[PDB]
Structure 1
Amino acid sequence: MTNIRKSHPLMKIINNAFIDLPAPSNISSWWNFGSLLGICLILQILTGLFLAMHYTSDTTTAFSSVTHICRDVNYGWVIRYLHANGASMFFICLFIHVGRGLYYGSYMFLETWNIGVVLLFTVMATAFMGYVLPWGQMSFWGATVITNLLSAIPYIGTDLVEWIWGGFSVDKATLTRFFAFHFILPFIITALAAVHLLFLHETGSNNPTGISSDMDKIPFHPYYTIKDILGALFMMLILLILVLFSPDLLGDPDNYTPANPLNTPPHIKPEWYFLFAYAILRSIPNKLGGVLALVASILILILMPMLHTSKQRSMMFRPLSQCLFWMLVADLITLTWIGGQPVEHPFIIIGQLASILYFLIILVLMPITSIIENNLLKW
């Protein structure tokens, strides 16, 4: 005989992936965010499927549709705010996982890291398209601002922007296209996540120490399944705190006014997850330079494996790199704060210096510091 778990094909795949997968025994709670990310993706898919049963993509009926969900669909407010704040939880976990990979040298898993970069881009696109769907003033004007950035691309910017718009400006066509894309993209994200896990399982999972843990591998089923359930429960606590006590904490009030294309909102600012890229974009005076810098901010992650110069994979045993990494985190927080703030004398200079510091820390300071640490260790 044979155990069905180990011999049946689908059960074989499932067992290898999450029941008998050799997992490092010293993985910390920063290794719970990724499974939290998958839970967030599933939760977003379900909540959105239930929302879309009541949402209409025509400009005449979109805002009324969202109001219908909030005030008339049974438990509709729960689903709507679960989706809205789940997007924020999604991006929080995404940033935390990017930080974990940066700090512990998980980017050395080149294929997994690059697939993750692709996933990050796809999720950002999904969030931006979703924000336009409610069709509030913020949705319309933020879409107008962000899409207009593509016009900067030389000799094809205008045609590409008009093709995306479906017309001369953001309008019913753009809303319908964004509803379709917002629906389809998450499943592409799920497939990319499957590829991500495949590539990760090829090489295993890096531990906090940065040293190979083949000696101390523990089964995932009797240990990390319960650890991830606990982490998911904590994340659910936070998300439900948002949904049931501060449903509008992370959202701008202006999106509760129907979009008026003839009057701009007093402040046109993107969602909080996009704010650092917005600050970087505003930092560069030239439009094309701003667009290229915004692209490079996310794409600099691709260059992270090459920039590695330390003889040690993880930053746990490298203090100066730890100081630089925490400087980078503070800089990202500063960029978000600046992107939220109006463009004025105090904020403009701070944003420019912060963008310079972000790129400098990633490209120059970190590798030179790693080399200095290598010399100090006599390596």
Structure 2
Amino acid sequence: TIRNQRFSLLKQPISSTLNQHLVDYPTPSNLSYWWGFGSLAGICLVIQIVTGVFLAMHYTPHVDLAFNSVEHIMRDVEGGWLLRYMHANGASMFFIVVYLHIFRGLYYASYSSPREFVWCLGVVIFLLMIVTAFIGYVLPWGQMSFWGATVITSLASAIPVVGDTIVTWLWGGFSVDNATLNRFFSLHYLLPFILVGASLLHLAALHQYGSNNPLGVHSEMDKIAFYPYFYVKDLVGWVAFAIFFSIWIFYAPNVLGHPDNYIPANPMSTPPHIVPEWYFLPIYAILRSIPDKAGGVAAIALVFICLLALPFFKSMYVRSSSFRPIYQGMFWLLLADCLLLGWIGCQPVEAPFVTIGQISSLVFFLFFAITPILGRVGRGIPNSYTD
């Protein structure tokens, strides 16, 4: 057809990119509610950015004023309590949603070809999220903030020759002090924007081939437009998430946190129990399961190495756990193991938890070691199960 006149405004150059990427984008008709969590994570990112921009209007990144500025946000600025509870529990909601997202991807083998780049960009995004949330948790300048910053900046000392110089460069001095807090503030404003860009790249990589589906099959024969069907499905998800988040905000605003951070930072005394936020606990457990500095840091790096190498394993040509009984069972064991690692990270470092943590870390790495063997062996299934 010859486009002499103007048809739908949606197809005009003003709107065409948004239309083709957001309204008319072909989507497999059989996507479950487990495909709602990417849009949920997007909404969590926007919520964090909006609340953090408004909170930065009242927060003072100085060791003599930071704790007091938080308290002033809670007590003095109107609706300040809401803004703070929303940012602090929205970090937790962001991590819950992103975990559910990562586990949908693991269950349906969404990392497999041709979507390897999508998975790698997601891994980069997860690293960015971890760094952002950690340096954000330092900002209130409570006991938890100071001591967590101490250990995470100390992690660089695992490097033999230049480790100390990196630690002292990160601090801006010989100890965690005002320089650390001020640089952590700047980084905290910056990293969310890089997260937005990385998420956009993630989405573009995913639309190169379209979304995977719960059957794991080629879906070109039964695709439907995103708007309105998956718009309204994601809206159901958005309202349910709002109810969940509101329950956390209004009735249990401090259950996902530790009371130690309501004590101003004291560089003299480490609290008897020193743990990160809940969403970092599995990494904490893997770190502490190694009785060696360099070994622990190397295990932390090996976690992300395995996550990045997952899409490139020579595998069988079957994606969905719905048709892979062994991989499905290994999936539900990995989920249990991750929940156990999180629980172990919250425990003091003593018996029986050292052995349990070591075995759990081993199981976690066994998942990624065994999946390629499963693929190689299952390549022979169609030749061995004859009609």
Measured against the shorter chain, the TM-score band is over 0.9
Q: Secondary structure at the match of 2:321?
A: coil
Is 1:242 aligned with 2:242?
A: no
- Equivalent residue, structure 1, for 2:87: 83
| Contact in 2 for aligned 1:151/1:157 (Cα 8 Å) | yes
- Equivalent residue, structure 2, for 1:349: 355
CA distance in 2, matches of 1:259, 1:132: 10
- Equivalent residue, structure 1, for 2:102: 98
| Contact in 1 for aligned 2:139/2:145 (Cα 8 Å) | yes
Give the C-alpha shift of residue 17 in structure 1: 1.5
| Contact in 2 for aligned 1:318/1:373 (Cα 8 Å) | no
Q: In terms of Rg, which structure is larger?
A: 2
Map 1:57-72 to 2 at 5 A. Answer: 57-72=61-76
- Equivalent residue, structure 1, for 2:277: 271
Q: Secondary structure at the match of 1:324?
A: helix
Q: TM-score, normalised by structure 1?
A: 0.97
Give the C-alpha shift of residue 372 in structure 1: 4.2
* Letter of the 2:96 counterpart: I
CA distance in 1, matches of 2:372, 2:190: 40
CA distance in 1, matches of 2:375, 2:210: 25
| Contact in 1 for aligned 2:214/2:320 (Cα 8 Å) | yes
CA distance in 2, matches of 1:212, 1:105: 14
Q: Unaligned stretches of 5+ in structure 2?
A: none
- Equivalent residue, structure 1, for 2:341: 335
Q: Secondary structure at the match of 1:222?
A: helix
- Equivalent residue, structure 2, for 1:73: 77
Q: Secondary structure at the match of 2:214?
A: coil
* Letter of the 1:313 counterpart: R
* Letter of the 2:364 counterpart: Y
The partner residue of 2:174 within 162, 168, 174 is 168
Q: Per-residue CA shift, 1:101-126, capped at 9, x if unaligned?
A: 11112112111111111111001000
The partner residue of 2:286 within 259, 280, 289 is 280
| Contact in 2 for aligned 1:321/1:370 (Cα 8 Å) | no
Q: TM-score, normalised by structure 2?
A: 0.95
**Once superposed, what is the RMSD of the aligned Cα atoms?**
1.2
Q: Secondary structure at the match of 1:218?
A: strand
**1:308–1:271 Cα change, 3 Å:** farther
Q: Secondary structure at the match of 1:342?
A: coil
Q: Unaligned stretches of 5+ in structure 1?
A: none
* Letter of the 2:155 counterpart: L
Map 1:1-379 to 2 at 5 A. Answer: 1-2=5-6, 3-9=8-14, 11-108=15-112, 109-364=115-370, 366-378=371-383
CA distance in 2, matches of 1:194, 1:283: 36
| Contact in 1 for aligned 2:116/2:312 (Cα 8 Å) | no
CA distance in 2, matches of 1:126, 1:351: 26
Q: Per-residue CA shift, 1:59-88, capped at 9, x if unaligned?
A: 100000000001111011111011111101
CA distance in 1, matches of 2:264, 2:201: 40
* Letter of the 1:21 counterpart: Y
CA distance in 2, matches of 1:31, 1:218: 14
CA distance in 2, matches of 1:22, 1:330: 35
CA distance in 1, matches of 2:82, 2:217: 44
| Contact in 1 for aligned 2:23/2:226 (Cα 8 Å) | yes
Q: Secondary structure at the match of 2:224?
A: strand
